[PDB]
């Protein structure tokens, strides 16, 4: 459990779109003029939840909390029908799942805190193309790097 949670929060730090202690008001101000689908993840200020997705809808920024229970992440079951909810060990996986599923929850482009490294941008690109890392013409160190973050967003 702590080992799994550690891996999940490490992935979340690698995204470049985790805003940590951002307040509710700060997120709305940040997403106010963003295109529809633009999203970020931040800490939830609510006792029952770890994280929140702040996302621009056509009607303004809105918030969807992420539950973390039994070592699994899932979207807010108070807002979404509990029975229709997929559970994930990884919260970046949760986000990636929904981003891809609309390529239900309309997520498109993340709001980066700062410019990602070129290395990381290359990783995203390679991830869009294959999961077969073992077959790539790269040194082991760079394969290890790809292995650390397998998501397309």
């Amino acid at each position: 459990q702590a080992a799994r949670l550690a891996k999940a929060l490490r992935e979340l730090g690698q995204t470049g779109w985790y805003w940590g202690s951002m307040t509710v008001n700060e997120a709305k101000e940040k997403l106010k003029e963003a295109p529809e689908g633009t999203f970020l993840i931040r800490d939830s200020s609510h006792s029952d939840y770890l994280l929140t997705i702040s996302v621009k809808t056509s009607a303004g920024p809105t918030n969807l909390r992420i539950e973390y229970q039994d070592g699994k992440f899932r979207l807010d079951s108070i807002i979404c029908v509990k029975s229709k909810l997929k559970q994930f060990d990884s919260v970046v996986h949760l986000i990636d799942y929904y981003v891809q599923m609309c390529k239900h929850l309309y997520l498109t482009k993340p709001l980066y805190t700062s410019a990602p490294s070129l290395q990381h941008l290359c990783r995203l690109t390679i991830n869009k193309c294959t999961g077969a890392i073992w077959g790539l013409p790269l040194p082991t160190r760079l394969k290890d790097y790809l292995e650390e973050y397998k998501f397309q967003v």
């Binding site: 390679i126 193309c129 294959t130 077959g135 790539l136």
Partner: protein
């Protein structure tokens, strides 16, 4: 700002300029780097020769069209004695075939 690649033969200059700045002013930038005066330069957008007095915006170099991550190409030709050389830009190298797994 408009983000540019000024290209001649096997030289490429990465630079930015205001949409409101002129072709001539861009030649002054080229002169500072490559040491050839404006009247020994011709600038192009594709095959279209660009007039000194036009702003970059009027030539079709807009902030939407010329981004940091995808700069617009300006071609550059120098004087070659009694004339101008033909506009010529050497292509960048070709990428290899994708690995199979990258399908």
């Amino acid at each position: 700002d408009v983000f540019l690649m000024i290209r001649r033969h096997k030289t490429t200059i990465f630079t930015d300029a205001k949409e409101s700045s002129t072709v001539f002013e861009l030649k002054r930038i080229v002169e500072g780097i490559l040491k050839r005066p404006p009247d020994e330069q011709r600038l192009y957008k594709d095959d279209q020769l660009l007039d000194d007095g036009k702003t970059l915006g009027e030539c079709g170099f807009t902030s939407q069209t010329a981004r940091p991550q995808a700069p617009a190409t300006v071609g550059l030709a120098f004087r070659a004695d009694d004339t101008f050389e033909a506009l010529c830009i050497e292509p960048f190298s070709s990428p290899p075939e994708l690995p199979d797994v990258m399908k």
